[PDB]
Amino acid sequence: QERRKKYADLAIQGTNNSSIASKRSVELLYLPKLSSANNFQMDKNNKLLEYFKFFVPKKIKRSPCINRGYWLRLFAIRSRLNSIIEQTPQDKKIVVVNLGCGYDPLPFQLLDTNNIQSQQYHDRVSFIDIDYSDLLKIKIELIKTIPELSKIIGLSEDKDYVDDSNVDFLTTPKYLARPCDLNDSKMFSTLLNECQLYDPNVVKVFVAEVSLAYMKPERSDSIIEATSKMENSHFIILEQLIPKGPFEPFSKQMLAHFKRNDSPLQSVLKYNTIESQVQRFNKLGFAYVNVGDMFQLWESADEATKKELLKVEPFDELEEFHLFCHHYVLCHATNYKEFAFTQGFLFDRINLTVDEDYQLLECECPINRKFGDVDVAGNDVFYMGGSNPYRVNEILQLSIHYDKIDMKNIEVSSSEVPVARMCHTFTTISRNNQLLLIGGRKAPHQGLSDNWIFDMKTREWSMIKSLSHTRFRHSACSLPDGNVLILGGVTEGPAMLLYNVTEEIFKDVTPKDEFFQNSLVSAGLEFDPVSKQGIILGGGFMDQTTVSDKAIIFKYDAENATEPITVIKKLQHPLFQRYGSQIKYITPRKLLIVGGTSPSGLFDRTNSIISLDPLSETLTSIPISRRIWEDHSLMLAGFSLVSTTIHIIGGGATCYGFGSVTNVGLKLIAIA
Numbered sequence: 001q002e003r004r005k006k007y008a009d010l011a012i013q014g015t016n017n018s019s020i021a022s023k024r025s026v027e028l029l030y031l032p033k034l035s036s037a038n039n040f041q042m043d044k045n046n047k048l049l050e051y052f053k054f055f056v057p058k059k060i061k062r063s064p065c066i067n068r069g070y071w072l073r074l075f076a077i078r079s080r081l082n083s084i085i086e087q088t089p090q091d092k093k094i095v096v097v098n099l100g101c102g103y104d105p106l107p108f109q110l111l112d113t114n115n116i117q118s119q120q121y122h123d124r125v126s127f128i129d130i131d132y133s134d135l136l137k138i139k140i141e142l143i144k145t146i147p148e149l150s151k152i153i154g155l156s157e158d159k160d161y162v163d164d165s166n167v168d169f170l171t172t173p174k175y176l177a178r179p180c181d182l183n184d185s186k187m188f189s190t191l192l193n194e195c196q197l198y199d200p201n202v203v204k205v206f207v208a209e210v211s212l213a214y215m216k217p218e219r220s221d222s223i224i225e226a227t228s229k230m231e232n233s234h235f236i237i238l239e240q241l242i243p244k245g246p247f248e249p250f251s252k253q254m255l256a257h258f259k260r261n262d263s264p265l266q267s268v269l270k271y272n273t274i275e276s277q278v279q280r281f282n283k284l285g286f287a288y289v290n291v292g293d294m295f296q297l298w299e300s301a302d303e304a305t306k307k308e309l310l311k312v313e314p315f316d317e318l319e320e321f322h323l324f325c326h327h328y329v330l331c332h333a334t335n336y337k338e339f340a341f342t343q344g345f346l347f348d349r350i351n352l353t354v355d356e357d358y359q360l361l362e363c364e365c366p367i368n369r370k371f372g373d374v375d376v377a378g379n380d381v382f383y384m385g386g387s388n389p390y391r392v393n394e395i396l397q398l399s400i401h402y403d404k405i406d407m408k409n410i411e412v413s414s415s416e417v418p419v420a421r422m423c424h425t426f427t428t429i430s431r432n433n434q435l436l437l438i439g440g441r442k443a444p445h446q447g448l449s450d451n452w453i454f455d456m457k458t459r460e461w462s463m464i465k466s467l468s469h470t471r472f473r474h475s476a477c478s479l480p481d482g483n484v485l486i487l488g489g490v491t492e493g494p495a496m497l498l499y500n501v502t503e504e505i506f507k508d509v510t511p512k513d514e515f516f517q518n519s520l521v522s523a524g525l526e527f528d529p530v531s532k533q534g535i536i537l538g539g540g541f542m543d544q545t546t547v548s549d550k551a552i553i554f555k556y557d558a559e560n561a562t563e564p565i566t567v568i569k570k571l572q573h574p575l576f577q578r579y580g581s582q583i584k585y586i587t588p589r590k591l592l593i594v595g596g597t598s599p600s601g602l603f604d605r606t607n608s609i610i611s612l613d614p615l616s617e618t619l620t621s622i623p624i625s626r627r628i629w630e631d632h633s634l635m636l637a638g639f640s641l642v643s644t645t646i647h648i649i650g651g652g653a654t655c656y657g658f659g660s661v662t663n664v665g666l667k668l669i670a671i672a
């Protein structure tokens with residue numbers, strides 16, 4: 001009974017172990033590499049200061065996606081506080097009240113007069129830290145026994161001990177620690193009054209950084225409503241969303257992960273979306289709301305900062321990052337009209353016809369790998385490379401049947417073979433007798449330039465001419481003369497290349513259109529020999545921020561030696577703004593568009609897979625049934641399309657350390 005509550009409470013307190021360690025990972029790897037502009041923590045001699053180290057027992061390392069997300073989380077809270085400190089008259093006291101503070105050293109980072117990067121916080125800002133008693137006991141003991149922390153808040157720095165380890169509160173002029181189980185709304189309301197937070201001459205900033213997330217909506221809402229009664233208050237909440245419901249690919253994994261750790265996300269079940277948070281805050285007494293998800297925060301970072309962030313460590317998991325970012329909200333509310341959400345801080349805030357000719361079915365293809373590539377060489381299908389979860393150079397031969405897909409490994413006969421890789425292309429050439437391997441990467445800082453041909457008959461690999469520039473996440477397609485068009489990728493090389501198979505030559509065929517001034521990463525690409533046209537769909541740019549919302553129609557003149565590729569037409573649509581999608585002509589007048597991720601939001605059952613008639617410029621939805629959406633592991637990242645009917649095979653994703661998901665497999669067939 002009470003054992004259940006105590007256990008639940010301690011499990012929730014334990015989530016702080018994970019977040020503090022992840023923040024420490026960022027302090028270790030990121031902050032030393034970011035200039036004074038976005039360092040958070042530096043002294044007058046340009047030397048980094050550290051605060052998270054006091055609260056974390058070991059060196060910490062996380063995946064690049066996780067680190068990037070935690071830097072973004074640090075930036076989220078700091079940016080909101082900056083907006084308040086910058087606008088509030090400098091004679092006013094500001095009190096930052098951290099609700100479920102865990103071991104977060106933010107107050108120390110901000111109050112430290114050695115930290116020249118927090119100078120605007122040194123004079124009139126105070127802090128109140130609130131968490132469960134048991135957790136605060138530990139935090140306070142650390143504060144009182146660590147000289148650097150004690151000095152910041154004016155305590156004795158000569159003590160490496162405490163008289164009483166059960167003390168769960170702390171009082172100093174600029175920092176209070178106050179125990180409260182936030183599920184006890186009445187105790188919290190009393191606490192606000194004991195701290196005199198009703199004083200209208202004092203600006204309050206309540207922060208709930210993935211803390212209220214663990215509480216039932218009735219309990220978290222009671223806290224929000226209690227703070228609304230304090231004149232001149234802000235409420236900043238940073239927590240999870242499930243914008244498309246609990247069965248969206250990433251959402252499903254996220255909810256299960258938190259449940260398995262006995263710290264379920266309870267409030268998000270009521271507040272699924274950005275709009276639901278606006279309505280929530282309005283109802284609870286905060287009329288003025290500025291809210292967006294984490295990708296909007298990323299887009300808002302200035303260029304210099306973006307440039308540095310990309311250079312901190314190798315990264316190439318943008319689909320995962322899109323998904324993560326759309327699952328976290330940053331909501332900043334106020335209860336007073338005088339506070340302006342200014343330009344630099346402000347967040348900006350369709351029913352397709354259902355296709356009647358084609359439908360989506362399950363069709364198991366447990367190749368269970370991602371970011372390889374595949375092509376058809378006669379009646380046969382060959383998939384090469386990718387990761388599962390480590391990179392391979394293996395070739396699978398696929399035999400496709402209406403109901404399932406058979407697979408066998410192809411033993412190779414040559415002494416030399418291409419290194420294991422992902423994000424390469426693999427394209428049929430040589431009248432269906434060979435397969436061309438272009439580029440790819442090992443780790444993200446290990447883009448490759450070595451190209452190969454695999455001969456099906458002899459099962460021998462041979463290395464051919466290398467690219468002058470490494471290139472991965474490019475797209476490729478076969479042309480009607482048997483040559484191969486190569487588009488974009490992460491590369492310093494030309495935006496578009498043509499590989500002439502017989503001549504063994506690469507040619508820069510970058511079209512004379514301003515669209516091609518920047519390399520396009522993970523775009524859909526296909527060419528139709530019948531209508532003699534091809535399409536480029538979506539694609540990101542090397543800023544890892546911008547994604548094209550264009551479908552570009554182009555044509556190929558084999559007899560033009562200098563300018564064989566020309567743009568015919570550009571179509572623009574929000575559902576074209578995808579990174580890591582694939583496209584395939586179902587018919588000369590019907591292009592299938594599958595998957596990928598978007599910077600503008602999450603795809604759902606109705607728009608993950610759509611179809612475009614490029615001539616008449618019509619669009620339809622190819623809906624994913626409730627059944628397959630809910631009951632099967634879908635994840636349209638790093639997948640491939642094959643047609644002997646189009647099979648959607650391979651793919652998957654690591655969901656921000658909430659577990660991994662493998663795309664099971666789909667098939668698009670004609671409706672009889």
Ligand SMILES: Nc1ncnc2c1ncn2[C@@H]1O[C@H](CSCC[C@H](N)C(=O)O)[C@@H](O)[C@H]1O
Binds near residue numbers: 135
């Ligand atoms: N009912 C409750 N009362 C007090 N604290 C709570 C609480 N429910 C959750 N929390 C606190 O919320 C914290 C979540 S971990 C996040 C810690 C901190 N806000 C940070 O971002 O670094 C935990 O320390 C947990 O104990």
